[PDB]
Design a protein around this nucleic acid. Structure first.
Ligand SMILES: [Mg+2]
Ligand SMILES: [Mg+2]
Ligand SMILES: [Mg+2]
Ligand SMILES: [Mg+2]
Ligand SMILES: [Mg+2]
Ligand SMILES: [Mg+2]
Ligand SMILES: [Mg+2]
Ligand SMILES: [Mg+2]
Ligand SMILES: [Mg+2]
Ligand SMILES: [Mg+2]
Ligand SMILES: [Mg+2]
Ligand SMILES: [Mg+2]
Ligand SMILES: [Mg+2]
Ligand SMILES: [Mg+2]
Ligand SMILES: [Mg+2]
Ligand SMILES: [Mg+2]
Ligand SMILES: [Mg+2]
Ligand SMILES: [Zn+2]
Lengths: 115, 217, 37, 174, 111, 69, 148
RNA sequence: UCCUUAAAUAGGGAUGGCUCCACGAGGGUUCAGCUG
RNA sequence: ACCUCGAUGUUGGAUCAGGACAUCCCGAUGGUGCAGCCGCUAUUAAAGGUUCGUUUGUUCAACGAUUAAAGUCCUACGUGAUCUGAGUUCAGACCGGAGUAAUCCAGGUCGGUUUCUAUCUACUUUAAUUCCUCCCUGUACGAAAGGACAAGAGAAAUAAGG
């Protein structure tokens, strides 16, 4: 569950995600009627003093059985259109993303590992 | 004789017929899927069919950090780190879509719950994905791994040092001061091991369950 | 329709009819002329 | 417990006749009514999900209390105002629960989801009244299921089509 | 049936400027075929994606659930995920900047 | 610099051979991709990157991690 | 292919001139809120719009509301966006304001007047009971020549 | 007008005039952490 | 200046809201300078709903991000025997100003006690909504751009009840 103000880890190849900054990326908005983001939900993110959309691809909060619970709240940066900003995702990405409603094919294509 | 935990019911007012029915279903599924004996701390590889794909199997290897639930809903959550990312999965034992459960390394740990591995060093959760299964002698008590893990800095998911957790597998002397340990002792509750009415005697229940299992065989 | 306190026929085909209790200016040719009292 | 069921004369059954779980069938939809779990006198926060008041920042002796109960003008409290009081222990009905399976040996009905009331409480079970399930009684035993009829001794377990029966080979989404 | 043969036939019929196919091994829990195709422009991409989707819809597999079309709002990359195959339509610059080929052939042996 | 002088050339030969029976993909694009991979990089690496490059090329040849059809 | 339209930027709201009084401070001082700025007007390009046939009449930008009591400011007028085809030349009476070509290319065609100041704006240690009520400045209004 | 925030009615900076060493249950602002 | 000066500060906020409709969204319609989508306008509709943050004591406002929408109001500017006291208001002190001074100030600032055990009335268990995706269907319409109705399925989310 990623809400507003959660510090999230950008698991992505993008320069924004991988560049140092005095402030850790924070969720600014959860694109969901209840501001609670799960895997597959989009969120605004304050990176490097910039507003950027991103996709949740894993979180510490337990989910339904058979699905992975990660040690960190992992997020992937995406453009407003939806193209992922980075070109590679290193850490494992849950396979449950595939059947969820919404566009995830680009993220799955960029993903290296699945869990 | 290892009676899998899920068969033993938690005490309550629920009717025994419900447990008989649930055990019937559990055993009748076990006839199809071989649920091996394993304990919290043993390394397991679980193969499960993915509905997201089209009849394709997924394998996850990790250390069983908790055995929870009773009856048909019983689960075990097992942990690992993949590319430096700690991942835990809670697997339902009797889910029709777990194709296989392999006990790669059958062993017991000092604690019945290894949830503190989240706060332990990542090395203690890392397990080779392709590790080969070790072999235990047919007649042999399950090994008890007396490993005491080293913890990462004090801010932890839970106050593991507190007595109510009763953790024996953590090297507290390394991370916590004697003052901190003494402070944690303020929650000791020594009477809690001596209140005889709190103890749950399951000898008769286990005997009846064993009779049921043997009859099913 | 347009609500008017005084109804005025605009073209030749605007006709007054009292329907459901009130007056209306209907018009086949120019439905823009539709008025309701 | 004795519960009254409204029926058409077509379905009258002689008093004294037993009824069995197989009176229902898998895939049917059912309504289950029972007394909910009695929680006794419960405050407004638990009974009605009121937000209560903040824990700190000065609040004195008001954390779980109802706020204003009405406006100043009416000079009374409207009937039906949400106030602390007894919660639960009232009859509630869950509608449209699917019957997933029937154990004829022990007369067990497996009803989808949750049912009101505690374990070992008597629930009144009837064919669902929802419009979507208005005329699904064609294939159900109309008056009731009569084992004495012995038209076909039912299996020990009747399953709905989609249920992953235990003992079947592990499902593969091929 | 609706298979990779039908996919490639339709794509060549509409004359995709470039086609590539990857046989995804079973142990990878995504799909069976990874089709990557380039196109002239966003209009061309949309046209061919709509065409192949209509063909899938009308051909067969009524019991098989319908299929999304992802990337409509973006102009340089669309993608359609079928039951056992996934097609990634894009432009040459998007393809060369994302190098999906190396990703999906060299799973852990690229940058 | 590489594992062996002929290893890379034999690898390229094997890739082209395996493309000979290429069926579904665009043969010309496949050849262009191989040429790019083996020309834009394999001129002036250091001695250490050669081992990694030839290893990844060999894995691609094997195709157990996904093959081009 | 050629069109003349009239725009009218929003007029700022007018400030208020009130005075506050409450049970233990009868002379609570100036209590007039500022008026809200008028709404800007903007021309924007759309690939969907083919020509200037779907044009209209005086595009009136919304006016900011007036200041209220309790120092309540007035809501600034909402921004009105006009839409035009790609590749539209916008001119004033000879002067060329913008050649709008790109999708979504947008230009401010008429600013909105600054809102008036309420009497509390003029409160100071020197001026303890201002009554001055500055009206909202008007917004730029002009005719636009549109040609593709 | 600049920095600080995604957003900054807040904060910081572009005899007299300055210089705050240290101190402060003083009054503001802030990083990080911590937390019902 | 008509009631209340023989213990009722006030503003905001919290809690809980009752109501009006002059409707912000959702519903049904007429017209259009509505081809379609879209708007604009008007009739009808009050069952339901009507966000979270930064500055500021703020109501407002600006700004950021959303939303189907972030409606206008009344209710002792609803509601302190339910809460809070940040502005303002009492005794302290500065800055600026007036004053010979004492003192004062519609100004700026730092600080500053919020009692009540309920007698009576009243009251304390009275058929969901929206959005998105998909099908229809990139079909109608349209030169194109663009893009529907109506009907149906699936997902969520919220609300209510368990
Ligand atoms: Mg910034
Ligand atoms: Mg925690
Ligand atoms: Mg609370
Ligand atoms: Mg308290
Ligand atoms: Mg602040
Ligand atoms: Mg001192
Ligand atoms: Mg008089
Ligand atoms: Mg009196
Ligand atoms: Mg009305
Ligand atoms: Mg009034
Ligand atoms: Mg105060
Ligand atoms: Mg004073
Ligand atoms: Mg003052
Ligand atoms: Mg003060
Ligand atoms: Mg103090
Ligand atoms: Mg009080
Ligand atoms: Mg009381
Ligand atoms: Zn007429």
């Amino acid at each position: 569950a990623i809400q507003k103000m959660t510090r999230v880890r950008v698991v992505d190849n993008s320069a924004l995600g991988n560049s140092p900054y005095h402030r850790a990326p924070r969720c600014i908005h959860v694109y969901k009627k209840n501001g609670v983001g799960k895997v597959g939900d989009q969120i605004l993110l304050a990176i490097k003093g910039q507003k950027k959309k991103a996709l949740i691809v894993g979180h510490c909060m337990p989910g339904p059985r058979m699905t992975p619970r990660f040690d960190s709240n992992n997020v992937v940066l995406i453009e407003d259109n939806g193209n992922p900003v980075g070109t590679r995702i290193k850490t494992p990405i849950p396979t449950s993303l595939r059947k969820r409603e919404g566009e995830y094919s680009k993220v799955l294509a960029i993903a290296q590992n699945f869990v | 004789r290892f009676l899998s935990p899920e068969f033993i019911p938690r005490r309550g007012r629920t009717d025994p017929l419900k447990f008989q029915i649930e055990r019937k279903d559990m055993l009748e599924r076990r006839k199809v899927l071989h649920i091996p004996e394993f304990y919290v701390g043993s390394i397991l590889r679980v193969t499960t069919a993915d509905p997201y794909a089209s009849g394709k199997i997924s394998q996850f290897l990790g250390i069983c950090i908790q055995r929870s639930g009773r009856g048909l809903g019983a689960t075990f959550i097992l942990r690992n780190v993949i590319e430096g990312q700690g991942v835990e999965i809670c697997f339902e034992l009797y889910n029709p879509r777990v194709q296989e459960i392999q006990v790669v390394k059958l062993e017991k740990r000092l604690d019945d719950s290894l949830l503190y591995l989240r706060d332990a060093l990542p090395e203690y959760s890392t397990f080779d994905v392709n590790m080969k299964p070790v072999v235990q002698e047919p007649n042999q008590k399950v090994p008890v791994n007396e490993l005491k893990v080293k913890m990462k800095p004090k801010p932890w998911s839970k106050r593991w040092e507190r007595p109510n957790f009763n953790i024996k597998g953590i090297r507290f002397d390394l991370c916590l001061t004697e003052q901190q340990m003494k402070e944690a002792q303020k929650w000791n509750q020594p009477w809690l091991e001596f209140d005889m009415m709190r103890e749950y005697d399951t000898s008769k229940i286990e005997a009846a369950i064993w009779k049921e299992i043997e009859a099913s065989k | 329709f347009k609500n008017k306190t005084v109804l005025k026929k605009r073209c030749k085909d605007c006709y007054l009819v009292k329907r459901r209790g009130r007056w209306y200016v209907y018009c086949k040719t120019h439905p823009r002329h539709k008025q309701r009292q | 417990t004795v519960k009254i069921f409204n029926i058409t004369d077509n379905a009258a059954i002689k008093p004294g006749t037993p009824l069995y779980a197989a009176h229902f069938r898998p895939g049917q939809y059912v309504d289950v009514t029972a007394k909910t779990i009695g929680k006794g006198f419960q405050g407004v926060m638990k009974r009605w999900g009121f937000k209560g008041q903040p824990a700190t920042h000065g609040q004195t002796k008001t954390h779980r209390r109802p706020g204003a109960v009405a406006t100043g003008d009416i000079g009374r409290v409207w009937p039906g105002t949400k106030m602390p009081g007894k919660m639960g222990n009232i009859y509630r009905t869950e509608y449209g629960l699917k019957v997933w399976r029937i154990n004829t040996k022990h007369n067990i009905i497996y009803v989808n989801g949750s049912v009101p009331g505690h374990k070992n409480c008597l629930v009144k079970v009837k064919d669902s009244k929802l419009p979507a399930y208005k005329d699904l009684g064609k294939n159900l035993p109309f008056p009731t299921y009569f084992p004495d009829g012995d038209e076909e001794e039912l299996p020990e377990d009747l399953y709905d089509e989609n249920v992953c029966q235990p003992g079947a080979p592990s499902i593969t989404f091929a | 049936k609706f298979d990779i043969d039908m996919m490639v036939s339709l794509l060549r019929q509409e004359n995709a400027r470039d086609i590539c196919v990857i046989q995804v091994p079973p142990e990878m829990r995504y799909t069976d075929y990874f089709v990557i195709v380039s196109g002239t422009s966003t209009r061309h991409l949309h046209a061919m994606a709509f065409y192949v989707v209509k063909m899938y819809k009308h051909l067969k597999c009524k019991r098989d659930p319908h299929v999304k079309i992802e990337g409509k709002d973006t102009d340089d990359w669309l993608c359609v995920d079928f039951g056992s195959m996934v097609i990634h339509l894009m432009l040459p610059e998007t393809r060369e900047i994302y190098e999906l080929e190396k990703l999906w052939t060299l799973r852990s042996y690229d940058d | 610099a590489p594992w062996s002088r002929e290893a890379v050339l034999s690898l390229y030969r094997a890739l082209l051979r395996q493309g000979r029976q290429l069926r579904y993909t665009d043969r010309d694009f496949y050849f262009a991709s191989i040429r790019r991979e083996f020309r834009k990089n394999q001129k002036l690496e250091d001695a250490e990157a050669r081992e990694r490059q030839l290893e990844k090329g060999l894995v691609f040849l094997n195709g157990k991690l996904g093959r081009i059809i | 292919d050629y069109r003349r339209v009239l725009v009218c930027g929003g007029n700022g709201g007018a400030g208020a001139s009130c005075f506050h009084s409450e049970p233990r401070k009868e002379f609570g001082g100036p209590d007039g809120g500022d008026g809200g700025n008028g709404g800007h007007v903007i021309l924007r390009v759309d690939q969907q719009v083919k020509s200037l046939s779907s044009v209209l009449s005086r595009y009136q930008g919304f006016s900011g509301e007036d200041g209220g009591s309790k120092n309540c400011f007035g809501r600034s007028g909402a921004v009105l966006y006009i839409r035009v085809p790609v590749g539209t030349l916008v001119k004033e009476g000879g002067r060329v304001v913008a050649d709008l070509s790109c999708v979504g290319d947008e230009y401010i065609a008429a600013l909105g007047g600054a809102g008036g100041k309420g009497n509390r704006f003029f409160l100071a240690n020197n001026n303890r009971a201002p009554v001055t009520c500055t009206p909202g400045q008007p917004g730029q209004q002009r005719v636009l020549h549109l040609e593709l």
